[PDB]
Symmetry: C3
Subunit: 149 residues, 3 copies
């Protein structure tokens, strides 16, 4: 009778775990997650970069960062407007790094990797046409978070 | 007479430097360091991840991190029980990084790189069988430090 | 008359932008910047590493770091004396990392990558002959900053 309940409750807990796993899978699917690929989500709210970082962190994802043409288009389609990307040149001007670390392996600048020569535009936004431009991290742009494949 | 002592004391200092260098070499050998390879050491104490990091840092090493099968086995043999590895997904859930930076180049997960979907298991322990599993950084596991080749 | 001034002032602002762009280009040229390559600059002042980092950061550059023989020689020629490089082993003894992150891809040590075994020499200086040696970050050496290609 003692271990009986513990057994029923343990199995009970397992069924809840299974239900939640499905809920998460279906949610991701509904959010447009492509099989075996990272996906992007937005609440369409515009805010300063620091807030975007905090929000994506709270959701256990990270600020969206395109690493190839496919992802650049995907983020573009989700944002629908100017949105911050997870890259900055806050530390070394003209040398953008992912917020999670490292030099860019892919980019889509309007021209070349931008050195602002002192004006302080250290964040990056992707515009309606998919191109990237440096901008002030204090400006308010659309928050787009990414989640793992 | 003036430079005479300075000369004798300087040479004296050099002999001590040489003795200590040998002491360090012999110690490493006794600790199981393989020729030209990094080595792992433990005091068999179990503690939270933050404490393991602080301790390995104090010893001027770092938390053990396997980068290939050989090292995974080596750490396993030294720990003899569950031990923390120098990798976490504290920052980006499901995307483990070395505490010293960078994405994993080698792993030995029970299944796939674990996304805890919110339960907060952001550290990693290697178990008796060599497999890796995410776990709470607050849990107490064996402290294993690594030193350079 | 209303938009007339705004137009003249906007164009006015554009001419100033163009003038400043040329000033910056000519300055870089005069500072010895080679076509399409990063360049190094110094004020010949000797100071602790923390101050060098702060100063290069204020100039929106970063502490000089040679990534190949060419750059090693270039920095050497600019410094003319012992100077700090943008690399340290403050975190993991014997494993030097760029201050901007990552393991070394090029080095020119007097011998091998130095493990100080506890004496705390965690910074790096390039000497008159181009060779590298670990040294105390508290010592005062020549400040050399680098700017992007
Ligand atoms: Ho920037
Ligand atoms: Ho995690
Ligand atoms: Ho060091």
């Amino acid at each position: 009778a003692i271990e009986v309940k513990l057994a029923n409750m343990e199995a009970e807990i397992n069924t809840l775990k299974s239900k939640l796993e499905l809920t998460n899978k279906l949610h991701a699917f509904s959010m447009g997650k492509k099989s075996g690929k990272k996906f992007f989500v937005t609440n369409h709210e515009r805010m300063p970069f620091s807030k975007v970082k905090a929000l994506c962190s709270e959701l256990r994802g990270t600020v969206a960062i395109p690493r190839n043409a496919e992802e650049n288009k995907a983020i573009q389609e989700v944002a629908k407007t100017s949105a911050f990307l997870g890259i900055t040149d806050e530390v070394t001007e003209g040398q953008f790094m992912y917020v999670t670390g490292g030099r860019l392996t892919y980019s889509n600048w309007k021209k070349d990797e931008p050195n602002d020569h002192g004006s302080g535009e250290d964040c990056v936004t992707i515009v309606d046409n998919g191109l990237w431009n440096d901008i002030s991290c204090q400006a308010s742009h659309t928050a787009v978070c990414e989640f793992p494949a």
